[PDB]
Design a protein around this ligand. Structure first.
Ligand SMILES: Nc1ncnc2c1ncn2[C@@H]1O[C@H](COP(=O)(O)O)[C@@H](O)[C@H]1O
Ligand SMILES: O=P(O)(O)OC[C@H]1O[C@H](OP(=O)(O)O)[C@H](O)[C@@H]1O
Ligand SMILES: O=P(O)(O)OC[C@H]1O[C@H](OP(=O)(O)O)[C@H](O)[C@@H]1O
Ligand SMILES: O=P(O)(O)OC[C@H]1O[C@H](OP(=O)(O)O)[C@H](O)[C@@H]1O
Ligand SMILES: O=P(O)(O)OC[C@H]1O[C@H](OP(=O)(O)O)[C@H](O)[C@@H]1O
Ligand SMILES: O=P(O)(O)OC[C@H]1O[C@H](OP(=O)(O)O)[C@H](O)[C@@H]1O
Ligand SMILES: [K+]
Ligand SMILES: [K+]
Ligand SMILES: [K+]
Lengths: 322, 322, 322, 322, 322, 322
């Protein structure tokens, strides 16, 4: 019940997308549980255990679609839970939580560097790469390919409604990479000059489907139409455990004013509904490879990544639940 | 040549897209020649003929892609040239121009009505319709189907960068028609609930391809993927004669500042290029029917429309050439 | 208002499908018009005119999907009407109706044997041909090719619910053509051994789509999948003039007792709805050729059959109307 | 050689399809093995062993296509065999056979209700689901989802020739699920209004293909065409171990009298062959997921189900062999 | 019966492909009938008529697949036949034949220049064009595009068995055009760098299929897979009249030694058959446009080219027949 | 290092393709290391280790694409390196090399046999099989299916530029198997009569793509178009480990003079470039099954083969690196 302010501020900052990107919100959430355990004034283990459960619930209940976030929380709290239930005293608990969270953060950072190097071998000198939204994993691949001296150009899609495309373009251009910026609508038109597509992921399902930023399934579709390789750069913690047992992933519907600003929308008629899905779902048939920190897989090998990292936990409850 | 200010002003408003839409700019160019003819101070028929040629060229060099405009100019000018060359006197030439421009304007208005009556028959009670940009021809269909008492909803795509979807959404709402407004990236995600696609055209080619607002081809692609009928509402003067003899249609590239506003765009590094094609091309295999004022055709019958109405002219030079 | 029993008997027999097959029902309506004229006790030209308009409406309100039937009634009534409006006396009108029926009925027979001759040229020695329902035009093709000494075998799908495939199997076998009889569900399984598919049509639209017995579109889809030629054998009076101006064809829904017999259906619970559609719609992209009495066309040239033989009549009302 | 009548009665009832459905026949063969052990008048361990090998062969030679049946006989006989070869006395062997049957039979029941639970998670409120034949695993899915309070409707294809769709329709309606009953030919026509397809399996191969009731592959093809999820609900004992080493599955050809009744068939000429295939084969590319009792897989992970649970046994001979 | 040697020598030279290419053999055949009429020693018209029939039969019976050849013969002999049957005297016949043949030859030459100019507008600066075999029509397009200053490169396929690819490569390279020469097998591999495909035709059917050099259908297929425009450059006399009435085009099977030289094949075992089809058939769905001397058409407009140039003659016998 | 002439001679014969075929060159490289080890005059184990490393590199730098060769070298050298580093004396090192090379050679021969026994089960009585190049693995399948008494015919493609089809045709004929020999361009034209496609592989990637003789991808493309099973017969040592970590396979570009002989080629102008890729890449969606010595897999299960047998090594440098 004695939740420190950094937990609430991180939760809010995930909700408002001031902190965004599936990897980042997962690291931020691990960091929040880390600080809760740093600054906790609890005396008993039972007390700190209970603070960490509640912090974890607050953080889970921010944004639903990227399983990166629950997987972060799980990574920390499977360990914290095993400690507490094994009889660890206060400081043995405090450290288990803090250290588990530090592990996840470090492993996330290393995973992304690694995805960069693996994916870059798939990029060739002269390539024109089209990307969508702003994905650290995808940018790692493109950045690495450029540092290897491959002379590349990236077609960056603006990525409505929230313009993540702007971030992507200034970022790649600041590393020296030539950028071509277009609207989402122009993806087919420019698919004819594109050699490779590199996008990220928020959740990957057991059958190989990729839930990523709205628009992704379209770029994928047309890439298939033209035989351009769709490469999804994604850490293993993007893979979605509960899809193993039949769960559909929730698609986050965000506020209509991200599309039509409040000052404008209030003046619009009542029979207009504005629908603002945050993600769509791309089928495995439109994906060439998924580049994980453990290597290149075909998208249908997602079930293998999950069988072996994740499946064990599905017979238990979540490690923050009563 | 002494060109009236209405010609210059029309030309600027077409360039700037204050006046926009394929059919409307064609009416605005007819109108402009009408007014050059009305307000002319010419004494000799050669002097007026010269004014009409120069005005025609000013209007021609506004926007390239939509062939409606050239076709409107031709409709007036073939007739003006036949009179002048057949020895018409000043007033008979003036009236030929005025009256030809009027006929085109009236024919365009009636054709749009007829297109609506025709396309509406293919809309069924309960249909969810997806559209793109703001096409008067497409809208005529939706408007008439609603007026027949069919309960429809229209999914309207915002149509970046110039946001024509806003015009379409407000217009359909004003007639009583519920709208679902979405970003362009969401067209595949909502194709699964869509019963019909209805878009316009700027130019249609001899092989049946449809040049229309940027992103049209994406929507038609995923429509096909999903077996949703793609219906293109379009006047005969949208069909492109020069394509009969192999001409490719120029795709208008518009200012970067429509995509990114000038204030923001001047802050960006020089190795980001903003590219803003205003149209793409949708191949005939992704189009179910074209709905013209003379009936439903498959897209490959575009050559028939071109043969029977515009082929005759391709042996002659352009009717405004001096 | 004095309508002869034969008109009523034909109508009732078209409704119960005792008279069936798109061509046959058309000939039966023409026959009925002919007999209404032959047996008329009408003493005035206006009195006969009124009997024929009324017989036409009775006949038109039997089965809606096959345009063959109304195109037959048209052929006659356009001619009856031009006579009546030109001032024709009684026996001139009676004869115009008698000799218009005769003409259509004889032209139907000639068209069907000519489709035989043309279609048989696309059947090759050794061919295995799959068909569906019982189409006289399809059968003419197959029977002619067997008479050219080509060793063929026909796969006859049983064609639920009304078992028309039994008629086809006994018919083709009676000519000495070996038949393979299968359930409809088995059409994909046998498509691998099939060389050609030959089916009939109830109506063909302006854009090339073919409305024919329920199932036809599935057989056509898997035929496309396997690159087996789908050939549609159809008289020019199967082409649907109203589709030129956007009309959709109504799909006859027939009695659920044709699917589940009345004795058994009455015992079933109300929360099972039985839906019996008599036709489906096959898109033009899955049709290699339509074989008409005037030649082979790609399905997209359906609009030409229509433009050249039927379009004239769409500016007038139906010839049996007040 | 002293085989108890129940074994003979089960075999005859699997042959006539009085006992049918891949799971049920498997449980029935296990039940029969169990009763052969219970009622055996055998005084030696070698005498019982020999009765069970012989009962197994009788049961295996009933219907070939569904691997479920031999995987059941295996489950038991592998265990009977290891006992017998380990030196087991009589009542130890009798019990090993009794308790292996029991185990398989109970595990079949648990597997089928677990597929219910997992599969139901992919059904969404409002869904219209098409199915085919009568599959207990498919039905468990649909029934569980209805018990979660999701308003669904099921389209039941009648499933010629043996009319299994009648069993499915009455079953689902008995649980209060509204049903739409249609002929098989109508599956493309209704695919446009279908949200999900759920079908069972008789055998699933190493590369993902699904052998199931004749028709299944057509429904799957048009489902793919329309981007409707095709979900296969199947116990792990439907997976076919011999396909790992290249074996193809035999397609049972059943009596032509199931298609044309004997009373009518005898009147037909000899040059009509009636071919009644009980199953077809659906390729993996047209299957979105297999739902097993252990999870959701892409169809290409069938080889893992097999590698991990069955492959061990392929270096030995069949457990009922000499 | 008094056939001059140039007729026999041309026939033989067509048979051996010393004269080849569909246009060329058509011109050569017209030329042969021209010389027969130059050097004829006939006295009566009836005598010369009879020489021209027999010359025509000799020339027709050379190579079967390119309808260019019969259409040449027809063009000359429809005119010669009308003259003779109208009562023309010897010299009026002699000139009719000679002049008709001179017309065809000139019109063929002009048609090809014209196809060149039309097709070249479809070629863009920088384009890499893949072609197949050696087609004058296709080369006209590429040559013209290069003379317009478009900087192009052509991928020339070797075109087994007869190596026409060598001719094509030396020809284009002698005009200054950069050539990349590859084997037929590499067409897919290099389809990714190709912007346009330009091939010729031997016969074009009523439904839009293109019979062209063996291999054409493959290049077309993969071009569709990659969305590369397939442009077929072809004169109207390549279009095939009798396909209007159901005729399949014969595919010429040429001597096995063109594949395996005689010195080698004689040593090969008896159970090896060498099959050497000269042409395959490409479906209309894989063709973007057909470029005729009358302009760009979609391939399904082939029936229109035939309806209007050719259909009239199909109610008559050939103009060389008794 | 004193390298025996057998190493140098093997290396030259691999380069020149005197010894060719993916599997054979791998055996020839094992063999060559065997012989370096047998005939070595080394006194110290370090001196032999050095010889084995240098020989390994000479053999590695022969031909790049087929990963069988590197894998054979690795099989021997991992084991040689473990011995040398574990302190083996001269003779124990010599024998480790000799014996490792022998095991690889024996395993390769047995694997090819097993592949035949496995693939043959998927060949049915009456099958027409199309193959490409000369693959011992594919041939083992065809040979065994014939020996099982299945009546097969094989369509053999000539496989330019090096004409490996000649080897395949003579070899299959010599076993009794009828052959149809065709040029590569005719593969689509004969796909319509083909029941099965059976080819080999040089390298198979982590995502399931198959690098095989130039034109393989074309044949698989049209096979897919036609629903003909594409089966790839291939040993586990054809699977490519470095692709697990993103490596793309180099495609061997061979001398222009294989395509055009040197005598002819020196006469050609310098602006013709002959390009001779020896392989292409066939994507996994066009492959039905890969038949390895351990069973049938779908192509996407290539990652499983790579994980379970070769992944372990990718953390270590190459076992011949100094
Ligand atoms: N050089 C290469 N090395 C490894 N994999 C490749 C290479 N080139 C293409 N691929 C893969 O093989 C397939 C070829 O696809 P496409 O580029 O459509 O021909 C894709 O699945 C790629 O991931
Ligand atoms: O983890 P990284 O690769 O950085 O981004 C992965 C994905 O998460 C983001 O979602 P949002 O912007 O938070 O909704 C984008 O959809 C992006 O592709
Ligand atoms: O003639 P209507 O149907 O109104 O418009 C047709 C098309 O012209 C417009 O172009 P723009 O907005 O002027 O660039 C849009 O592309 C629209 O679909
Ligand atoms: O195991 P469950 O899911 O009940 O049924 C599986 C399958 O078995 C049935 O076969 P048949 O009626 O025995 O020929 C049907 O093909 C059904 O899909
Ligand atoms: O008329 P042009 O365009 O020159 O050639 C047309 C076609 O005829 C040739 O046949 P062949 O070499 O005579 O069998 C080639 O197939 C070529 O594409
Ligand atoms: O191992 P096996 O099955 O014999 O051969 C496999 C493949 O290797 C060969 O390459 P090349 O002829 O050496 O360039 C061919 O591509 C062939 O299909
Ligand atoms: K591209
Ligand atoms: K390309
Ligand atoms: K085939």
């Amino acid at each position: 019940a004695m939740i420190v302010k950094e937990v609430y501020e991180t939760a809010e900052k995930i909700k408002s997308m001031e902190i965004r990107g599936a990897g980042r919100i997962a690291r931020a959430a691990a960091q929040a549980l880390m600080i809760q355990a740093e600054k906790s004034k609890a005396k008993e283990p039972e007390e700190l255990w209970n603070e960490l459960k509640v912090a974890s619930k607050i953080l889970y209940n921010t944004r639903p679609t990227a399983v990166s976030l629950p997987n972060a929380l799980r990574y920390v709290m499977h360990r914290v839970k095993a400690a507490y239930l094994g009889g660890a005293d206060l400081e043995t608990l405090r450290f288990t939580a803090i250290n588990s969270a530090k592990e996840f953060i470090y492993n996330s950072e290393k995973a992304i560097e690694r995805i960069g190097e693996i994916g870059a071998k798939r990029i060739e000198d002269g390539d024109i790469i089209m990307t969508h939204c702003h994905s650290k994993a995808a940018i790692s691949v493109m950045k690495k390919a450029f540092e290897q001296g491959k002379n590349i150009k990236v077609i960056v899609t603006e990525t409505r409604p929230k313009w993540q495309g702007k971030i992507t373009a200034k970022e790649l251009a600041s590393y020296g990479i030539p950028v071509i910026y277009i609207v989402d609508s122009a993806a087919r038109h420019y698919m004819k000059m594109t050699d490779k597509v590199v996008m990220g992921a928020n959740s990957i399902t057991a059958n190989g489907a990729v839930i990523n930023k709205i628009g992704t399934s379209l770029i994928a579709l047309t890439a298939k139409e033209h035989r351009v390789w769709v490469m999804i750069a994604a850490e293993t913690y993007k893979f979605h455990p509960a899809t193993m047992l039949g769960q559909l992933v929730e698609i986050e519907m965000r506020d209509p004013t991200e599309v039509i600003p409040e000052e404008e929308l209030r003046t619009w008629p009542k029979n207009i509904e504005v629908w603002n899905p945050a993600f769509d779902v791309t089928p495995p048939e439109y994906i060439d490879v998924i580049i994980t920190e453990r290597g290149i897989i075909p998208p249908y090998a997602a079930i293998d990544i999950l069988k072996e990292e994740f499946g064990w936990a599905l017979k238990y409850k979540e490690p923050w639940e009563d």
